[PDB]
């Protein structure tokens, strides 16, 4: 309720109330900002990470690897300080394919070498942590390499580190995954990509993780409509009947989840099937924060 009814960026005592809100108990909101869609990358983009709403908890930097150098300069010099001034954490996302890359030795020294290279993506930009996107099964050698890299990362990130920085596991699979069984003690938050899924199936998925976490570590995700992308239908109108809204309201039996996240937060409020790029005032993101924290 200290949060704006529009996309105002607060400045004084009004900002302090938002910074205080974020230090208190609340269900959190995270968003994946597609880096190649930022106005500081390439041409034709409409949204800047500077537009993100004051009441966001975590912004993920999610690149595809063809971003212009201008994006990375802007992130380091402009975006991270500005987002930090709003009490928004900024986390780098990487795919699990980066941690199982056979160019890196599958040995203790190689796990540390690869962890060191991943930590540069956090430290060189002043970020708040690392998010690993796990969307495939692993063979025995891949599981050994990924587990080694997580254990090396845990010296600098996540609950084993004592640094306050985050180590996040985001996944479209469940708590039976061998990698999860190997690395759960290193994890800050676990984020379940739940695009297009049944509300009746959420407790099953949560139950596969709940022995390995507390409930406040657990976030479920919906997707905005990506231009030319999958029609998940998570953001149908009317909003209060959407999958995204039902996710904001859902709770596991007898516990409180950590919150929700969006994929492609840069697309907040674009109609399903509209393949043009548009500015956003983050109406969905802001309304969903109010749905979770009434």
| DSSP output for 71-94 | HHHHIIIIIHHHHHHTT-EEEEEE
Q: Is 64 a catalytic residue?
A: no
Cis peptide before 238 (omega within 30 of 0): yes
Pairing of strands 28-34, 129-134: unpaired
User: From CA 146, how far away is CA 223, in angstroms rounded?
Assistant: 27
User: From CA 189, how far away is CA 129, in angstroms rounded?
Assistant: 11
What was the structure determination method? Answer: X-ray
User: From CA 260, how far away is CA 21, in angstroms rounded?
Assistant: 17
Sequence-distant (≥ 6) Cβ neighbours of residue 221 within 8 angstroms: 170, 191, 192, 193, 194, 195, 247, 260, 261, 262, 263
User: From CA 162, how far away is CA 12, in angstroms rounded?
Assistant: 31
Sequence-distant (≥ 6) Cβ neighbours of residue 24 within 8 angstroms: none
Sequence-distant (≥ 6) Cβ neighbours of residue 29 within 8 angstroms: 55, 56, 57, 58, 259, 260, 261, 262, 285, 288, 289, 292
Closest to 187 (Cα-Cα) out of 151, 235, 238: 151
Is 38 strand, coil or helix? strand
Closest to 49 (Cα-Cα) out of 65, 32, 66, 69: 32
User: From CA 266, how far away is CA 91, in angstroms rounded?
Assistant: 16
Closest to 130 (Cα-Cα) out of 163, 105, 100: 163
Catalytic residue among 64, 67, 135, 227: 135
User: From CA 209, how far away is CA 176, in angstroms rounded?
Assistant: 8
Resolution (A): 1.8
């Amino acid at each position: 309720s200290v949060c704006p009814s529009d996309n105002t960026h607060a400045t004084g005592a009004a900002l302090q109330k938002i910074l205080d809100y974020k230090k208190g108990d609340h269900q959190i909101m995270a968003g994946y900002f597609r880096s190649w869609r930022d106005t500081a990358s390439g041409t034709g983009n409409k949204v800047s990470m500077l537009d993100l709403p004051d009441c966001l908890d975590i912004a993920f930097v999610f690149p595809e690897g063809d971003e212009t150098a201008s994006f990375w300069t802007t992130l380091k010099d402009t975006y991270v300080p500005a987002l930090h001034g709003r009490g928004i954490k900024v986390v780098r996302s990487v795919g699990i394919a980066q941690l199982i890359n056979t160019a890196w030795d599958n040995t203790p020294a190689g796990w540390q070498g690869l962890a060191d290279a991943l930590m540069k993506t956090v430290d060189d930009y002043g970020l708040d942590g690392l998010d690993i996107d796990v969307e495939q099964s692993l063979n025995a050698n891949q599981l050994k390499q990924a587990t080694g890299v997580f254990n090396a990362l845990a010296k600098k990130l996540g609950p084993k580190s004592g640094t306050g920085k985050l180590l996040i596991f985001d996944t479209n699979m469940d708590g039976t995954q061998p990698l999860w069984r190997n690395v759960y003690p290193t994890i800050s938050y676990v984020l379940i990509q739940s695009y297009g899924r049944s509300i009746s199936g959420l407790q099953t998925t949560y139950n596969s993780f709940k022995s390995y976490i507390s409930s406040k570590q657990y976030l479920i995700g919906f997707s905005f409509y990506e231009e030319n992308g999958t029609n998940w239908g998570d953001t149908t109108t009317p909003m209060t009947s959407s999958r995204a809204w039902q996710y904001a309201k859902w709770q596991p039996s007898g516990a409180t989840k950590g919150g929700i996240f969006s994929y492609a937060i840069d697309r907040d409020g674009v109609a399903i099937g509209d393949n043009t790029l548009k500015t956003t005032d983050f109406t969905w993101t802001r309304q969903l924060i109010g749905a979770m924290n009434p």
